[PDB]
Amino acid sequence: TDNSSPPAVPQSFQVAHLHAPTGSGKSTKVPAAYAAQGYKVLVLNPSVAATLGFGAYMSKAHGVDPNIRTGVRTITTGSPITYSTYGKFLADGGCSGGAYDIIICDECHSTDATSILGIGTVLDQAETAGARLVVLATATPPGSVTVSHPNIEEVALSTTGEIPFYGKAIPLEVIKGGRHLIFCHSKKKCDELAAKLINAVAYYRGLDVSVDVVVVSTDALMFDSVIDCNTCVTQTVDFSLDPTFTIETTTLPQDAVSRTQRRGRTGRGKPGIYRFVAPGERPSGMFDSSVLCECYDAGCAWYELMPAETTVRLRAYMNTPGLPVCQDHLEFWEGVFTGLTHIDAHFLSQTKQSGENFPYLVAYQATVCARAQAPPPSWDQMWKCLIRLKPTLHGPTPLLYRLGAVQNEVTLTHPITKYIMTCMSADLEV
């Protein structure tokens, strides 16, 4: 059941789509109104700062002290309103019997691994746990394109101008001076776009913050004008058959959510300017198979889910209409992780702690290397859990799959490598 207004609570279980503008209190006004009717309500967000910031707002302005549930900080007050991150909801085990009448999946357009595994978990479990209503809330449903902003200047940036931007040319005036934000697809391009620059400072993170100025930043940032390269760097899987698959990055046209949010960081009350390298954009609503791979990695590394349980939750996500779509590779990734047995627990513990991208994949490749007394695929910091070059310098690397640049010599005959190749044959089409 799709709509622009807060769907009333049905007598029996339903999943409803809520498509409403961002500030219009989908995360605050909607849960409060459900609560004023006497319902216990859960509000899920991808962001820890958002989660923490909703709790804050409702206290400052509203005299309501919600339960707040994040990895870093958990507060229990007994309020009918709970705010939680998707990831903390997953750690809590998902839906616990009878706890909530309503579950709002906020920003349900998010395609990060936890949002998708989280939403999938709600859709698989909410009815059984006694929820009456699941609400799938976003401002930007699948298919969305960016629209006119009343209070934002948008004028095409042309050939003529004095700086090398992105095949186009911003002309002096516009960043001298005042406060200006400039988006680039990469860290490197940030650090020496600014080096060329008028006051200017680069952000992408590792860094904290550094608030007349010109900021040159990736999207890692959480303003008179915005300057937009209109492109983003995205993680994709390549089924490279060398021997198996590769996790790499690709530079794509930004999609609608990207373009709106980048533009959105100007013109907040004060009329602001948006300028661009390129007019068009990807519509919102697609994500990559590498995100499914992330989901299984996280189930295994963080949430103690057998691959087959993760599948059940992600299957719930894919059978649900009006959500971002991706290749159906559930069988394949399930097969892959299911064959990854007896990981070395200490290596897993380190890769998780170290914040690597696929800590299960990293720790498992390191496990194979240790047990074959072979070196990691490179001596990149990804593999530092093997600092102990000395015995495991014995020869070529038994290469399960590609997570980064590979520097060592490699061997492609390890049974796990052959196991994954067989899974590729079994589960991937044409």
Binding site for ligand 2T7 (CB under 6 A): 48, 70-71, 85, 87-88, 91, 112-114, 294, 298, 302
* CB contact at 8 A, 242 and 402: yes
331 interface partner picked from ligand 2T7, Ca ion, its own copies, none, CB below 5 to 8 A per type: its own copies
φ, ψ of residue 114 to 5 degrees: the values are -60, -40
Q: Looking up tokens 């746990």, which residue turns up?
A: 129
**How many other CB atoms are there within 10 angstroms of residue 300's CB atom?**
23
Among 71, 93, 143, 271, binds its own copies (CB under 8 A): 143
Judged by CB under 8 A, the stretch of 53-61, 218-226, 321-329, 381-389 that binds its own copies is 321-329
Q: Which of residues 411-430 bind its own copies (CB under 8 A)?
A: 429-430
349 interface partner picked from Ca ion, ligand 2T7, its own copies, none, CB below 5 to 8 A per type: none
Q: Which is nearer to ligand 2T7, 48 or 221 (CB)?
A: 48
* CB contact at 8 A, 47 and 87: no
Has 238 been labeled as part of a binding site? yes
113 interface partner picked from its own copies, Ca ion, ligand 2T7, none, CB below 5 to 8 A per type: ligand 2T7
What CA–CA distance (Å, rounded) separates 336 from 323? Answer: 25
φ, ψ of residue 54 to 5 degrees: the values are -70, -40
Q: Which is nearer to its own copies, 320 or 349 (CB)?
A: 320
- As given in the structure block, the two tokens for residue 139 are 């401002």
* CB contact at 8 A, 93 and 106: no
* CB contact at 8 A, 355 and 363: no
Residue 152 binds its own copies (CB under 8 A): no
Residue nearest Ca ion, CB atom distance? 238
What CA–CA distance (Å, rounded) separates 411 from 408? Answer: 10
Q: Looking up tokens 């400072």, which residue turns up?
A: 201
Q: Which is nearer to its own copies, 330 or 362 (CB)?
A: 330
Q: Give the x-and-dash track for 326-365 against its own copies (CB under 8 A).
A: xxx-xx----------------------------------
Q: Which is nearer to Ca ion, 240 or 249 (CB)?
A: 240
Has 328 been labeled as part of a binding site? no
- How many residues at the interface with its own copies, by CB under 8 A? 45
Q: Which of residues 163-182 bind its own copies (CB under 8 A)?
A: 166-167
* CB contact at 8 A, 298 and 118: no
Q: Which of residues 235-264 bind its own copies (CB under 8 A)?
A: 238, 240, 249, 251-253, 256
What CA–CA distance (Å, rounded) separates 404 from 51? Answer: 33
* Peptide bond between residue 243 and the one before it cis (omega within 30 degrees of 0): yes
Cβ at position 137, least distance to its own copies in Å: 17
Residue nearest ligand 2T7, CB atom distance? 87
How is residue 281 annotated by DSSP?
A: -
Strands (E), 157-309: 179-183, 201-203, 213-217, 225-228, 231-238, 246-253, 272-276
395 interface partner picked from Ca ion, its own copies, ligand 2T7, none, CB below 5 to 8 A per type: none
Of 107, 133, 126, the residue nearest 8 (C-alpha): 133
- As given in the structure block, the two tokens for residue 159 are 């050939």
Residue 373 binds its own copies (CB under 8 A): no
Among 319, 373, 407, 422, binds its own copies (CB under 8 A): 319
* CB contact at 8 A, 81 and 31: yes
Beta strand 231-238 pairing with 246-253: antiparallel
Among 112, 127, 191, 238, binds Ca ion (CB under 5 A): 238
User: What one-letter code names the amino acid at 100?
Assistant: Y
What lies within 8 Å, CB to CB, of 257 at 6+ separation is 109, 140, 144, 284
Judged by CB under 8 A, the stretch of 31-39, 56-64, 200-208, 273-281 that binds its own copies is 273-281
Q: Which is nearer to ligand 2T7, 50 or 374 (CB)?
A: 50
Binding site for Ca ion (CB under 5 A): 238, 240
Annotated binding-site residues read: 238, 248
Q: Which residues are annotated as a binding site for Ca(2+)?
A: 238, 248
Residues that bind its own copies (CB under 8 A): 142-145, 156, 166-167, 185-186, 188-189, 231, 233, 238, 240, 249, 251-253, 256, 277-286, 318-328, 330-331, 429-430
